Ligand binder design. Structure first.
Ligand SMILES: [Zn+2]
Ligand SMILES: [Zn+2]
Ligand SMILES: [Zn+2]
Length: 766
């Protein structure tokens, strides 16, 4: 014949490519074959005519499997010693794939009459649908997945078997007959089979709220359009401000609903269907209830059969999807618990047979100036790895809040699902199960040690110990901030580099509540650099909770005891700790502060900026995680004339307090917003500028921002920008999240390095 020895390599092997190459071939009737060698050997000999010799190579790009991106194609030229009457996939390393959203094709298939799965919720092809959330354990096989309880009906099998058909070997395949079925409940009571689905939505728009059995953990739903009902929900859940998550029909709806970014629309239509957060249009459309004091809004698009179909009816597009579980508990899997927890919470229920083994909270992502990073690693990512410059089988618990344990081997770390806040015992036990599962796709008796935040009180590290004492495995802790900063040089794959850490509450080395300082990740003998003049805050935890408890502590570093009294009078935030505790009495606590009796030393940028959020008309008592930092940002955006502040930087200390000083001296004249906006850049600019100077006086080409207060667009904008008068820097991107959640990754590449011996056994402790 007259073909071309096309040579491709990069993503083909592991993922499902053979099934694709086969179909695409026969479709163009171009008989040939696709050889296979291994992790690096899959060519294609499409020997045939010309009107198709091109179509094949042309389609391979625009039609390749989802979890795959062609990387190499060399049109060679070799004649087959024998023409090809049939196309063959002659063969001779499976990898747990993540949960993908419905494929553009299957969509039409269900959303349209002609098909067998006409309006079938559990629709799916071999190029999408659920995976991890229902993969019992490798080998990846039907007989070994949640879909096992469902024997395939003849019709399907025929397809499942046939190669040409896309549903080929689609383990999680089904139909309205052999496939699972939906149902409608209401704190008990129900109908049967398919009568529900349709009606289900007729209620979501009706006003009432109803939970939905997602693919990786069911969650409450509600018409985000009815300001009335949405508010109701916030009560049955005891959640006052946490930015709810909405789900619009098509991208269009998202537009008039708010703001659509360029590569954003891409990140949305992604196979992961994450909950991005884009600015809401000035003339607020949806009820201001969905999320107060926040320019952004949780946006979601349909992601699996039931979604699109459910969206059909209900008239109103925008819905509302949030972890169906009391504030503090993880998603509810077993329908059993669905009733034993939301009997009062939700109004109705919509569950299905197919059990959701592993939990999987929806992944949320928000873009920043420099690039586009995420915050919640889960949903459609896990269990996809990230490369570590070191090989060592080990576990890494990580932070305690917004945690995400990890495990690596050969040189790749594994970020788990959003194990939420390891606080409540409910959570703790959850992690154990997750780790157990992960360990079933890896090695037992991990030939290597563990990792945990340098805090001897985290329900996380708590495990690290008992776990260490178990199976007899060495234990190792590491600074919290040295992690966020490490999570960068691990994802960007590089060597020691200066970086800025701005977290809300980090267990710094030496009982020092860090959260604002630049460090040097020098491979050898690592050490701290810049810093903030520790400010006195009453109640380590209390301070974070009640803002005024910190606003005072920081003003003492510039004002006297009785002085702090007057300055506070610049506003009236006393009635804050009054709606949840005593008021005057709190101010009386000033003694505890003045006398320096009971006081813990901090340096968190989150708190610093937090105080500024109360030293104004912004916010008061914290209602969840990072409420001020965010509330203060949004408010700041509305500022035009960028004022010019300049938080000092002496030797290796930042008199950030002096910032407040000047801040107040401008209130009498400068608009309210312009202040929040100004201080934002100011605090950041002089904060980064330091990292810069230090880089030069230490021979380093680049720096890296990361940690809690890292998503602040205003700050991240200036900071990274300042690095323009130096060397190209980088901040954690989509792959890994700068936030706490992605701390384990930083730990893995960090502690794992310790084993290597390239790091001192104690330059992580002290
Ligand atoms: Zn599909
Ligand atoms: Zn079937
Ligand atoms: Zn953190």
């Amino acid at each position: 014949m007259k073909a071309y020895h096309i040579h491709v390599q990069g993503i083909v092997q592991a993922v499902g490519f053979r099934p694709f190459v086969y179909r695409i071939a026969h479709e163009h009737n171009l008989r040939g074959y696709v050889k296979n060698l291994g992790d690096a050997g899959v060519e294609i000999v499409v020997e045939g005519r010309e009107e198709d010799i091109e179509a094949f190579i042309e389609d391979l790009y625009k039609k390749k499997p989802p979890l795959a991106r062609i990387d190499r194609i060399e049109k060679k030229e070799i004649p087959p010693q024998g023409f090809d009457r049939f196309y063959i996939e002659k063969s001779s390393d499976s990898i747990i794939p993540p949960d993908i959203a419905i494929c553009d094709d299957c969509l039409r298939e269900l959303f349209d009459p002609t098909n067998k799965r006409y309006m079938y919720p559990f629709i799916v092809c071999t190029n999408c649908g659920p995976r991890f959330t229902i993969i019992e354990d490798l080998p990846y096989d039907r007989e070994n997945t949640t879909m096992k309880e469902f024997p395939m009906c003849d019709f399907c099998r025929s397809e499942y078997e046939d190669p040409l058909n896309r549903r080929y070997h689609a383990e999680p395949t089904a139909c309205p007959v052999c496939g699972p079925s939906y149902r409608l409940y209401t704190s008990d009571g129900q109908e049967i089979y398919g009568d529900p689905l349709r009606k289900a939505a007729e209620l979501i728009d009706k006003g009432y709220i109803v939970a939905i059995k997602g693919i990786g953990g069911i969650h409450l739903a509600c018409d985000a359009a009815n300001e009335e009902v949405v508010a109701e929900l916030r009560r049955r859940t005891f959640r006052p401000q946490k930015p709810f998550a909405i789900m619009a029909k098509d991208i269009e709806t998202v537009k008039s609903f708010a703001y659509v970014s360029p590569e954003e629309e891409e990140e949305l239509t992604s196979y992961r269907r994450p909950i991005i957060t884009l600015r809401k249009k000035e003339p607020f459309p949806l009820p201001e209830n969905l999320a107060p004091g926040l320019h952004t809004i949780g946006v979601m698009l349909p992601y699996a059969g039931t979604h699109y179909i459910l969206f059909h009816w209900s008239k109103t597009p925008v819905y509302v999807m949030t972890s169906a579980n009391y504030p503090g508990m993880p998603m509810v899997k077993d329908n059993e618990r669905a009733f034993e927890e939301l009997k009062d919470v939700a109004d109705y229920f919509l569950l299905h047979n197919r059990k959701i083994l592993n939990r999987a909270d929806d992944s949320v992502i928000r873009f920043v100036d420099g690039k586009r990073a995420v915050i919640r690693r889960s949903r459609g990512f896990v269990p996809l790895p990230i490369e570590i410059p070191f090989e060592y089988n080990g576990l890494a618990v990580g932070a305690e809040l917004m945690n995400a344990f990890g495990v690596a081997k050969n040189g790749k770390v594994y970020p788990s699902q959003y194990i939420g806040n390891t606080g409540k015992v409910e959570v703790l036990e959850f992690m154990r199960e997750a780790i157990a599962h992960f360990r079933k796709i890896l090695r037992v008796k991990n030939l290597d040690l563990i990792i945990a935040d340098l805090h001897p009180a985290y329900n996380t590290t708590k495990l690290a110990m008992e776990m260490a004492n178990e199976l007899d495995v060495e234990l190792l802790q590491v600074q919290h901030h040295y992690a966020h900063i490490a999570s960068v040089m691990a994802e960007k794959n590089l060597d020691s580099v200066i970086g800025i850490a701005l977290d809300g509450v980090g267990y710094g080395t030496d009982g020092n509540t860090w959260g604002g300082e630049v460090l040097y990740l020098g491979y050898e003998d690592v050490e701290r650099l810049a810093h903030i003049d520790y400010y006195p805050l009453p109640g380590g935890d209390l301070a974070s909770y009640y803002p005024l408890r910190a606003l005072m502590g920081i003003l003492s570093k510039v004002y006297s005891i009785d002085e702090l009294e007057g300055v506070i009078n610049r506003c009236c935030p006393k009635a804050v700790e009054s709606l949840k505790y005593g008021k005057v009495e709190f101010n009386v606590v000033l003694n505890q502060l003045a006398k320096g009796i009971n006081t813990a030393y901090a340096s968190s940028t989150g708190r610093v900026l937090d105080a500024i959020a109360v030293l104004l008309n912004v916010a008061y008592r914290r209602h969840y995680e990072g409420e001020p930092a965010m509330k203060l940002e949004s408010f700041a955006f509305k500022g035009k004339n960028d004022l010019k502040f300049e938080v000092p930087v002496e030797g290796e200390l930042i008199r950030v307090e002096e910032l407040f000083q000047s801040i107040l001296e401008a209130i009498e004249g400068a608009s309210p917003a312009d202040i929040a906006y100004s201080a934002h850049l100011a605090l950041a600019r002089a904060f980064a500028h330091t990292a810069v100077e230090r880089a030069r006086e230490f021979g380093v080409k680049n720096v890296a921002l990361s940690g809690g207060v890292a998503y602040n667009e205003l700050i991240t904008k200036m900071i990274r920008k300042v690095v323009e008068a130096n060397g190209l820097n980088f901040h954690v991107t989509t792959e890994v999240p700068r936030g706490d959640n992605g701390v384990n990754v930083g730990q893995a590449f960090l502690g794992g390095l310790y084993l290597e011996g390239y790091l001192t056994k104690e330059d992580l402790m002290l």
